[PDB]
Design an enzyme around this catalytic site. Structure first.
Site, mmCIF file in Angstrom:
data_model
loop_
_atom_site.group_PDB
_atom_site.id
_atom_site.type_symbol
_atom_site.label_atom_id
_atom_site.label_comp_id
_atom_site.label_asym_id
_atom_site.label_seq_id
_atom_site.Cartn_x
_atom_site.Cartn_y
_atom_site.Cartn_z
ATOM 1 N N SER A 197 0.768 -1.232 0.000
ATOM 2 C CA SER A 197 0.000 0.000 0.000
ATOM 3 C C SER A 197 0.803 1.288 0.000
ATOM 4 O O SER A 197 0.209 2.360 -0.023
ATOM 5 C CB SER A 197 -1.068 0.017 1.079
ATOM 6 N N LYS A 244 -0.562 3.371 -2.676
ATOM 7 C CA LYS A 244 -1.710 4.270 -2.530
ATOM 8 C C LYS A 244 -1.346 5.715 -2.858
ATOM 9 O O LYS A 244 -2.185 6.475 -3.344
ATOM 10 C CB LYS A 244 -2.321 4.226 -1.127
ATOM 11 N N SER A 275 -6.384 0.506 7.040
ATOM 12 C CA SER A 275 -6.027 -0.816 6.568
ATOM 13 C C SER A 275 -7.279 -1.541 6.112
ATOM 14 O O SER A 275 -8.367 -1.325 6.653
ATOM 15 C CB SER A 275 -5.354 -1.613 7.689
ATOM 16 N N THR A 280 2.608 3.470 5.264
ATOM 17 C CA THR A 280 2.991 2.092 5.515
ATOM 18 C C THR A 280 2.543 1.156 4.389
ATOM 19 O O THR A 280 1.617 1.444 3.623
ATOM 20 C CB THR A 280 2.341 1.569 6.796
ATOM 21 N N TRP A 306 2.340 -3.405 3.807
ATOM 22 C CA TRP A 306 2.666 -4.745 4.261
ATOM 23 C C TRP A 306 2.049 -5.716 3.275
ATOM 24 O O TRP A 306 0.828 -5.829 3.190
ATOM 25 C CB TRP A 306 2.133 -4.978 5.682
ATOM 26 N N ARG A 365 7.209 -1.372 12.334
ATOM 27 C CA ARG A 365 7.781 -0.516 11.302
ATOM 28 C C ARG A 365 7.955 0.904 11.825
ATOM 29 O O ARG A 365 9.032 1.489 11.711
ATOM 30 C CB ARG A 365 6.883 -0.529 10.063
#
Length: 242
Positions: A48, A51, A95, A186, A188, A228
């Protein structure tokens, strides 16, 4: 001084029992830290972190706007009067929401591929499925490429409208403290092997100076997502960036 910085951050990553790199870009100068520096020039799916680029493309091409509220069928929500409206900007931080998949479908495979090629993001390959290529491939990008991308965004140097860049930057604020602003995103990729975790962004220091970063590490399923952020923040403090 530098050797101390190197040693300490290497140890920070070792303490989490995983392999990671932190790329720092300060005015055309790039430094690498962590315990797996070779990751810096290795391609990974962006997850992501994409994004950011999805939003730029979607806004530039008028497939959405910063005021649009998105909706879908999901888990029962309560006290929604105290929830932020589900705009593109709100969804940036969230998320497992389908907003960016929807935006990708609006953009469409052809336009998305053309834009990704024009930007030259990573290997610039999006394959045939427009709504998941950033999570499972074939799109891949190195941490050095990510720090360069986000540095350009921070400086309004990407090839998009100034207003679109400003709007996306505004979606990326993570925290402000004592006049320091940390912007970032972030990622993942949980469903590939090995898993990859990202935190890519920049610090705007109180006097206006920008220091860009890209953290990239191997994830395991038992890790808290915040690992992270934790590694980033302690490393930025060690480097006196914050």
């Amino acid at each position: 001084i530098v050797q101390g910085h190197n040693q300490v951050i290497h140890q920070y990553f070792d303490e989490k029992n995983t392999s990671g790199v932190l790329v720092i870009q300060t005015d055309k100068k790039i430094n690498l830290y962590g315990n797996a520096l070779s990751r810096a020039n290795t391609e990974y799916v962006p997850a992501s972190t994409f994004k950011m680029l999805n939003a730029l493309i979607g806004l530039e091409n008028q497939k959405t706007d910063i005021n649009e509220i998105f909706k879908w069928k999901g888990e029962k929500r309560s006290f929604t009067a105290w929830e932020k409206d589900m705009t593109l900007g709100e969804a940036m931080k969230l998320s497992a929401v389908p907003v960016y998949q929807e935006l990708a479908r609006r953009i469409g495979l052809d336009l998305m591929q053309k834009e990704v090629k024009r930007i030259g993001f990573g290997n610039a390959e999006i394959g045939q499925q427009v709504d998941n290529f950033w999570l499972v491939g074939p799109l891949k990008v190195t941490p050095i490429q990510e720090v360069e991308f986000v540095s350009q965004l921070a400086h309004t140097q990407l090839p998009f409208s100034e207003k679109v860049q400003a709007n996306v930057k505004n979606m990326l604020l993570l925290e402000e403290s004592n006049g320091y602003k940390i912007f970032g995103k972030t990622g993942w990729a949980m469903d590939i092997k090995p898993q990859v975790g990202w935190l890519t962004g920049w610090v705007e220091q109180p006097d206006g100076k920008i220091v860009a970063f890209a953290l990239n590490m191997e994830m395991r399923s038992e890790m808290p997502a915040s690992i992270r952020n934790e590694l980033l923040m302690k490393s930025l403090k060690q480097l006196n960036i914050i």
